[PDB]
Amino acid sequence: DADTTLFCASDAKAHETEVHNVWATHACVPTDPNPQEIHLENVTENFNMWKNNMVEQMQEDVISLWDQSLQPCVKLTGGSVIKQACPKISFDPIPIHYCTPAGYVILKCNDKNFNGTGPCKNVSSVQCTHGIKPVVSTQLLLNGSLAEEEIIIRSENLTNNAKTIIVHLNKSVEINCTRPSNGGDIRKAYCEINGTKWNKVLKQVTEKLKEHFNNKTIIFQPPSGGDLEITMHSFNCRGEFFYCNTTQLFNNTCITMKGCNGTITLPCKIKQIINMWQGTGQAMYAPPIDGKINCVSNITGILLTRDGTSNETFRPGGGNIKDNWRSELYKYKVVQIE
């Protein structure tokens, strides 16, 4: 085990004006051609998704992608009220692999039901990793990778209620968020989620959370309050900040046979004055562009918080963007050959 300079490993094209390509060129580098994956024989490696510096390396690194390409018109840190430029951009995250340098290789937990902290049996070793889309969001984890056998619950400390719980799903549920054209508030948008698919997943999640809380009861309520970014589903859709009210997604009403089934349309809005996930402060952007704005994402995860005799109430949480990267780098670890 060790902790080294894990360099950004790209897959970008040196001629696209898309902002995730014009940043990988500068920080990331080309990928390893034929990546190694030899199955380590009779090996027991201990992992900790909450300590793997790959999370720190990425968080520190993803910040640079937003500073370079998502400059807000006005930043409002403590005291100073800085101004700069607001060029509208082409925005669509591209995957980032994290190769290791010579002397160190990445151990990859190939277990199906490993929860995040403990031993992995089927341990392999690789140079790069599978692609990671740098999607910043709250409550729901988008455009990731799915679980392989069952839904897995990942929490650094379940008893510590203030810790966010990560739910990794075994089947995806697409979410199609759209700001329509003249078809009229240009700041108004909506997201469509399959109610039949979603409630079946929530039911599966509801059944899974029983096994971790002594087979008791489950309740999904809406967040208490505070910043919109955590009380609503927030994400960037092609340079536009979306905030979507997820009251209809976490509706205990629809986890028997009633009026579920139908399409779940969430009222969303496009904020210009948003809170910064870089650090403490607020920023301000420009109003949206002409035409259609579309984002067909894939809910591959859910970020939940607990209030903490019987019932156990949960809330859509998130906020700590470090945990977004922990939903994709849990199966990786850096050691050393020398």
Binding site: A162, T164, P223, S224, G225, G226, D227, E229, I230, N275, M276, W277, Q278, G279, T280, T305, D307, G317, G318, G319, N320, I321, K322
Partner: peptide
């Protein structure tokens, strides 16, 4: 996170203030 302001807010609703990373949470 702005915790002082976070706590200042969530007592308007009658709740305590929690930093959730760089953002404010109420319980």
């Amino acid at each position: 996170x702005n915790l002082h302001f976070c706590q200042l807010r969530c007592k308007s609703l009658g709740l305590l203030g929690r930093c959730a990373x760089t953002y404010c949470a109420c319980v």
